[PDB]
Design a protein around this ligand. Structure first.
Ligand SMILES: *[C@@H]1O[C@H](CO)[C@@H](O[C@@H]2O[C@H](CO)[C@@H](O[C@@H]3O[C@H](CO[C@H]4O[C@H](CO[C@H]5O[C@H](CO)[C@@H](O)[C@H](O)[C@@H]5O)[C@@H](O)[C@H](O[C@H]5O[C@H](CO)[C@@H](O)[C@H](O)[C@@H]5O)[C@@H]4O)[C@@H](O)[C@H](O[C@H]4O[C@H](CO)[C@@H](O)[C@H](O)[C@@H]4O[C@H]4O[C@H](CO)[C@@H](O)[C@H](O)[C@@H]4O[C@H]4O[C@H](CO)[C@@H](O)[C@H](O)[C@@H]4O)[C@@H]3O)[C@H](O)[C@H]2NC(C)=O)[C@H](O)[C@H]1NC(C)=O
Ligand SMILES: *[C@@H]1O[C@H](CO)[C@@H](O[C@@H]2O[C@H](CO)[C@@H](O[C@@H]3O[C@H](CO[C@H]4O[C@H](CO)[C@@H](O)[C@H](O)[C@@H]4O)[C@@H](O)[C@H](O[C@H]4O[C@H](CO)[C@@H](O)[C@H](O)[C@@H]4O)[C@@H]3O)[C@H](O)[C@H]2NC(C)=O)[C@H](O)[C@H]1NC(C)=O
Ligand SMILES: *[C@@H]1O[C@H](CO)[C@@H](O[C@@H]2O[C@H](CO)[C@@H](O[C@@H]3O[C@H](CO)[C@@H](O)[C@H](O[C@H]4O[C@H](CO)[C@@H](O)[C@H](O)[C@@H]4O)[C@@H]3O)[C@H](O)[C@H]2NC(C)=O)[C@H](O)[C@H]1NC(C)=O
Ligand SMILES: *[C@@H]1O[C@H](CO)[C@@H](O[C@@H]2O[C@H](CO)[C@@H](O[C@@H]3O[C@H](CO)[C@@H](O)[C@H](O[C@H]4O[C@H](CO)[C@@H](O)[C@H](O)[C@@H]4O)[C@@H]3O)[C@H](O)[C@H]2NC(C)=O)[C@H](O)[C@H]1NC(C)=O
Ligand SMILES: *[C@@H]1O[C@H](CO)[C@@H](O[C@@H]2O[C@H](CO)[C@@H](O[C@@H]3O[C@H](CO)[C@@H](O)[C@H](O)[C@@H]3O)[C@H](O)[C@H]2NC(C)=O)[C@H](O)[C@H]1NC(C)=O
Ligand SMILES: *[C@@H]1O[C@H](CO)[C@@H](O[C@@H]2O[C@H](CO)[C@@H](O)[C@H](O)[C@H]2NC(C)=O)[C@H](O)[C@H]1NC(C)=O
Ligand SMILES: *[C@@H]1O[C@H](CO)[C@@H](O[C@@H]2O[C@H](CO)[C@@H](O)[C@H](O)[C@H]2NC(C)=O)[C@H](O)[C@H]1NC(C)=O
Ligand SMILES: *[C@@H]1O[C@H](CO)[C@@H](O[C@@H]2O[C@H](CO)[C@@H](O)[C@H](O)[C@H]2NC(C)=O)[C@H](O)[C@H]1NC(C)=O
Ligand SMILES: *[C@@H]1O[C@H](CO)[C@@H](O[C@@H]2O[C@H](CO)[C@@H](O)[C@H](O)[C@H]2NC(C)=O)[C@H](O)[C@H]1NC(C)=O
Ligand SMILES: *[C@@H]1O[C@H](CO)[C@@H](O[C@@H]2O[C@H](CO)[C@@H](O)[C@H](O)[C@H]2NC(C)=O)[C@H](O)[C@H]1NC(C)=O
Ligand SMILES: *[C@@H]1O[C@H](CO)[C@@H](O[C@@H]2O[C@H](CO)[C@@H](O)[C@H](O)[C@H]2NC(C)=O)[C@H](O)[C@H]1NC(C)=O
Ligand SMILES: *[C@@H]1O[C@H](CO)[C@@H](O)[C@H](O)[C@H]1NC(C)=O
Ligand SMILES: *[C@@H]1O[C@H](CO)[C@@H](O)[C@H](O)[C@H]1NC(C)=O
Ligand SMILES: *[C@@H]1O[C@H](CO)[C@@H](O)[C@H](O)[C@H]1NC(C)=O
Ligand SMILES: *[C@@H]1O[C@H](CO)[C@@H](O)[C@H](O)[C@H]1NC(C)=O
Lengths: 128, 348, 105, 132, 128
């Protein structure tokens, strides 16, 4: 199985910075990229960025640069190589950013690209 | 053997034998560590002070002078021996100031054999009987689709295997102009390989004169540490020419406007963030690993109408190449001022 | 620190700690009862007023002692000499070196 | 041509604020750096430090608190104030001009250089003596 | 490269014993033999002996027996196996033995025998 566990929903103040974790388990964590996506009511989805957890090479959306940050922490033991932790630190909080966030992974087929994200987390609601 | 009237469709991205090269170089890199020494008695309590230097409180000294208990060749007697390391290899464990190595809790670091070196030599991958290798000799070939002029060969040409994250070194130069290649241009999760025509000369050096000192771990076990720093404590760095860098960035701008239309504003900004060796460009200058800052290069903007860029580096001794779970590697210090001349050939 | 050389001969006065990195020495002299006076302000550079033959060891050497080379000495050079090294590894010396005295026949 | 001239009390009671003055001749206080240096009898000199306009007033960190250097652009003089005269403070003191200069050994942009000092001309001295 | 470093020229008294070192570098020291030869003015060359540094097996010239001695010291580390030191202790010094000495190694080719010494040291002058 492929499991993506988020944290619970959180309520913040304007001008703060929310840290959202994303634990992945059930596959080799160093191979597949991690995307972050958002869902705002009456706006639809909006893309945030991706991070390859092999090194931590990231890419952000152009209109969100300077506010977001992505890190990862690998699993360093020869017994549990599968699980891994990704992060997303979102700063510059406004009341417009009240939305549901998802951290997603692509499929594993041969014709599967990167953006057709197969596996999804349960979502985290951020209200400002 | 140059063929006639023939056309085959190629694909560099779904190609085989790049995976085979990756697996072969990883496994062969692992194979040159088994005769060498494990640093099992070295993950130990390190009494570190500042290196003897005129200390600036705003900046930081990049060398910590650490003395420690070490077992001699005899099992009963132990000695007190000192060495020099960088900030990037030790961490403070929690008055007194005692440090430890950063890899004390993941793996024992196999020391690289100082006999063997890490310079590249050309490997030719030859096909067995019943198989052949086809090489496309078309000039304007973007690495995907049908190539009109191919030729069969028994072995490939010289591939110097470089370890370079950004700014690939010693590559094969392009024919007449800059060529950008990607699997899918509108995909921004796919990297773009830029290979340009004229090479850019880059010089790199560590000017700090070091002293190799041997410590006897046990019977037939030698640990090579840093002794005295003979002279000035300077920062290791690299140089490129300003004019050729500006010209080649103009060339890649001229070629990049073919894929996004003419009225497009192209700017170059530095890497966004991650680990050390994916945001800064890392390479190996004769058995010594540099991690050099590329903010001075990708700092430009381009509108649709004698000097030399110096860039500082950091030097690490322990590496975690290919990011394995339990495989780290110490690198021995090497004598004298270390300089290398290389050619920046492309970009990622 | 008593060095004597019958006049007209050469003279080598050492002073201060051994070098660690690059250095910028400053040589001062002091007649008895007078103020001090500069003779050398760099490793081997002198200002006006003081003549030549007061050569200095270059600071590009690693791991040596600062020397002061005098040829064709006289009764005017009979003074107390002082060094003020400025090493690029050691900190700023707010005190001078050790008093080396020259005396002539 | 420049020559300097100091002035002081000469006899100091202990635990008393010592103050010295330093005249000019030819070159004013604005045109150059200034320095104070002290020296006991039969000893090597001790450079107390240097004073200049625009914050260039770094002192010897050995004393670092009980000594304050100052200028007088109105009367065009140099001045020094001391605090807590002890028995070791009996010395001849000097005001003297000095010149900077960059010794460069590595990259200029990486701050691999420094600025050394050297005193070209000197004063004449004031035999300060602490006694009761 | 193949480098043969001798010691400097030395001046001795009659009846003493001169020790001349020969450090070899740039090849596998245990494989090739080391010969010693002399050059005396108005006498030409004259052979002294050889030593195989693999064990120290020596052979001396007949007319110099009782006076000469040959030893070696190997390089015992897995990092620098190439270099090695040979020695020659010459005793029973007379004023006739003032000469220039050489420690030599044969070539590495297939038809190369033992006595065609390719590589030569810089020579050591011994004056009695
Ligand atoms: C990548 O790129 C970067 C940058 O792009 C490179 O980084 C550069 O790296 C080099 C080398 O690493 C550095 O060079 C050092 O420079 C300093 C500063 O040099 C300047 O200042 C000197 C003194 O200034 C006086 O003269 C000038 C007039 O020139 C005057 O304006 C000023 O007010 C003052 O009065 C000048 O002499 C010097 O000029 C020299 O270079 C010119 C270049 O073309 C040349 O035309 C001149 O003719 C002249 O040759 C320059 O303006 C130097 O001080 C330093 O050299 C000293 O230090 C090293 C290490 O200690 C030592 O080996 C040298 O021998 C030298 O030490 C002598 O000089 C001291 C001066 O007082 C003296 O005290 C010493 O005792 C010693 O003196 C002995 O020799 C001299 C004769 O030399 C003799 O008179 C004495 O009696 C005694 O015998 C280095 O040269 C660059 O600064 C650095 N940065 C930049 C921005 O360039 C990097 O290297 C590149 N990397 C790669 C791999 O490519
Ligand atoms: C891209 O491609 C270029 C072209 O080859 C590479 O540049 C060479 O890099 C190697 C490895 O760093 C250099 O080799 C080393 O050079 C040192 C300098 O000595 C040179 O000069 C002397 C005098 O002329 C020559 O005798 C010598 O052969 C060199 O040409 C040497 O000190 C080194 O030797 C030491 O290590 C070897 C390792 O086996 C020992 O055998 C030796 O005994 C000694 O201990 C070594 O040879 C080479 O000089 C570079 N060439 C040039 C022209 O600069 C780039 O390195 C490459 N890019 C990358 C990232 O690797
Ligand atoms: C060894 O390293 C020390 C650093 O710990 C270094 O001491 C510094 O020396 C310089 C001059 O030798 C001192 O003076 C500075 O000079 C520059 C150049 O003009 C000025 O710009 C500086 O002014 C700034 O800093 C002041 C505070 O110090 C401010 O008041 C001012 O507004 C400016 O912001 C300054 O005057 C410098 O003060 C010291 N450093 C310290 C911490 O005191 C020493 O020279 C080195 N020795 C050798 C041999 O290399
Ligand atoms: C790769 O190289 C780049 C430059 O080539 C390097 O960027 C620099 O990093 C430092 C710190 O990481 C930046 O911050 C400075 O730090 C000093 C430390 O005290 C501050 O005093 C500086 O403030 C001065 O400048 C301000 C703006 O002018 C003034 O408002 C202020 O009063 C001070 O005068 C400053 O904050 C530094 O700014 C950058 N340089 C640039 C051009 O951005 C980068 O760190 C290197 N990469 C890595 C990974 O280290
Ligand atoms: C890409 O270029 C930018 C532009 O400078 C770099 O941003 C700079 O990053 C440094 C840290 O690497 C920041 O330094 C700061 O120093 C203070 C001093 O204590 C510290 O508190 C901060 O936490 C931080 O370390 C610097 O302010 C920052 N400048 C700007 C304008 O953002 C960036 O690092 C470069 N990226 C790479 C990979 O080189
Ligand atoms: C690192 O620290 C060691 C001490 O553990 C220094 O070694 C001493 O250096 C002083 C200064 O010359 C000598 O008086 C001692 O005899 C040295 N002790 C030993 C055991 O060597 C060493 O110099 C320091 N290294 C650096 C580069 O600062
Ligand atoms: C020795 O290294 C320590 C760090 O372990 C230095 O302590 C701090 O260093 C930073 C930057 O080097 C300064 O900004 C702090 O002010 C230092 N702390 C204190 C309390 O001073 C320390 O300065 C170094 N030098 C000495 C002589 O201990
Ligand atoms: C090397 O070993 C000695 C011997 O154990 C260590 O010295 C001891 O340090 C502890 C903690 O500071 C003291 O309580 C003991 O009294 C010391 N014993 C002796 C015999 O000195 C030392 O810390 C070790 N490390 C270094 C760098 O010397
Ligand atoms: C690489 O070149 C090939 C042609 O040799 C391009 O492939 C064609 O691109 C056009 C669009 O310009 C399509 O209409 C065709 O269907 C493509 N043919 C095939 C077989 O793919 C390809 O787009 C180029 N790729 C890049 C990244 O420039
Ligand atoms: C680095 O330091 C070594 C000293 O350990 C320098 O080697 C010396 O070189 C001088 C002349 O160049 C010789 O007289 C010494 O005998 C050498 N000493 C040793 C121990 O080899 C070396 O030259 C230095 N490197 C540079 C680039 O200056
Ligand atoms: C990089 O290093 C090379 C040397 O390896 C430099 O080329 C030399 O340049 C000088 C002028 O600066 C010429 O006088 C020499 O003849 C050149 N030598 C060689 C071998 O090319 C080059 O200038 C360096 N580049 C930078 C930017 O510093
Ligand atoms: C090893 O120690 C470092 C320093 O505290 C820590 O950051 C890292 O997570 C540790 N690794 C493991 C596998 O515990
Ligand atoms: C851009 O301009 C060039 C002229 O150099 C022209 O050949 C090309 O078709 C233009 N491209 C677009 C997208 O307009
Ligand atoms: C980018 O270029 C500007 C102007 O050329 C320069 O001031 C700045 O320092 C550069 N950026 C960095 C990070 O050095
Ligand atoms: C080992 O010890 C012996 C006895 O002192 C000595 O003769 C020999 O040279 C040593 N070997 C090495 C490799 O140090």
């Amino acid at each position: 199985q492929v499991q993506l566990v988020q944290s619970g929903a959180v309520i913040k103040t304007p001008g703060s910075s929310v840290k959202i974790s994303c634990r992945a388990s059930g596959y080799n964590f160093r191979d597949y990229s991690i995307h972050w996506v958002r869902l705002i009511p009456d706006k639809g989805f909006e893309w945030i960025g991706w991070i390859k957890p092999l090194w931590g090479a990231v890419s952000y959306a152009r209109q969100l640069q300077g506010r977001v940050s992505m890190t990862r922490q690998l699993s360093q033991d020869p017994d549990d190589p599968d699980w891994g932790v990704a992060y997303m630190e979102f700063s510059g909080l406004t009341p417009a950013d009240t939305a549901e966030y998802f951290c997603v992974r692509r499929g594993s087929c041969d014709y599967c690209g990167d953006f057709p994200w197969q596996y999804w987390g349960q979502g985290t609601v951020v209200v400002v | 053997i140059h063929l006639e009237n023939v056309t085959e469709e190629f694909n560099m991205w779904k190609n085989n034998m790049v995976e085979q090269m990756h697996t072969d170089i990883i496994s062969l890199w692992d194979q040159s560590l088994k005769p060498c020494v494990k640093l099992t008695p070295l993950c130990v309590t390190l009494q570190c002070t500042n290196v003897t230097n005129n200390i600036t409180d705003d900046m930081r000294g990049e060398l910590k002078n650490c003395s420690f208990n070490m077992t001699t060749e005899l099992r009963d007697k132990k000695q007190k021996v000192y060495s020099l390391f960088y900030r990037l290899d030790v961490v403070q464990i929690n008055s007194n100031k005692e440090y430890r190595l950063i890899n004390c809790n993941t793996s024992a670091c196999t020391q690289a054999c100082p006999k063997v070196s890490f310079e590249p030599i050309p490997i030719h991958y030859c096909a067995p009987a019943g198989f052949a290798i086809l090489k496309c000799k078309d000039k304007k070939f973007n690495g995907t689709g049908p190539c009109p002029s191919v030729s069969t060969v028994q072995c490939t040409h010289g591939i110097k295997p470089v370890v370079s994250t950004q700014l690939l070194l010693n590559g094969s130069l392009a024919e007449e102009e800059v060529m950008i290649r990607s699997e899918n241009i509108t995909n921004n999760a796919k990297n773009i390989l830029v290979q340009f025509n004229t090479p850019v000369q880059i010089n790199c050096t560590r000017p700090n004169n070091n002293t190799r000192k041997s410590i006897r771990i046990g019977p037939g076990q030698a640990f090579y540490a840093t002794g005295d720093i003979i002279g000035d404590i300077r920062q290791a760095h690299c140089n490129v020419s300003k004019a050729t860098w500006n010209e080649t960035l103009g060339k890649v701008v001229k070629q990049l406007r073919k894929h996004f239309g003419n009225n497009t504003i192209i700017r170059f900004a530095n890497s966004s963030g991650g680990d050390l060796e994916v945001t800064t460009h890392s390479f190996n200058c004769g058995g010594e690993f540099f991690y050099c800052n590329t903010s001075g290069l990708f700092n430009s903007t381009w509108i649709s109408n004698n000097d030399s860029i110096t860039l500082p580096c950091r030097i690490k001794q322990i590496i975690n190449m290919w990011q394995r779970i339990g495989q780290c590697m110490y690198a021995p210090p090497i004598q004298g001022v270390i300089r290398c001349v290389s050619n920046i050939t492309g970009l990622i | 620190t008593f060095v004597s050389v019958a006049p007209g001969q050469t003279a080598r006065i050492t002073c201060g700690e051994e070098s660690l990195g690059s250095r910028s020495v400053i040589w001062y002299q002091q007649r008895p009862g007078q103020a001090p006076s500069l003779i050398i302000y760099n490793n081997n550079d002198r200002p006006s007023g003081i003549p030549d033959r007061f050569s200095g060891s270059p600071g590009s050497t690693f791991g040596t002692t600062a020397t002061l080379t005098i040829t064709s000495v006289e009764a005017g050079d009979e003074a107390d000499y002082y060094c003020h090294i400025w090493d690029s590894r050691r900190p700023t010396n707010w005190v001078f070196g050790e008093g080396t005295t020259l005396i002539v026949l | 041509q420049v020559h300097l001239q100091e002035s002081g009390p000469g006899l100091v009671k202990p635990s008393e604020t010592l103050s010295l003055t330093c005249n000019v001749s030819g070159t004013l206080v604005r045109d150059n750096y200034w320095s104070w240096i002290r020296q006991p009898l039969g000893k090597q000199p001790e450079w107390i430090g240097y004073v200049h306009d625009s914050g260039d007033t770094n002192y010897n960190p050995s004393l670092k608190s009980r000594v304050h250097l100052s200028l007088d652009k109105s009367k065009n003089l140099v001045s020094l104030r001391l605090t807590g005269v002890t028995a070791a403070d009996s010395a001849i003191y000097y005001c003297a001009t000095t010149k900077h200069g960059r010794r460069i050994y590595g990259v200029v942009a990486f701050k691999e250089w420094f600025t050394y000092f050297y005193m070209d001309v000197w004063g004449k001295g004031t035999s300060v003596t602490v006694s009761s």
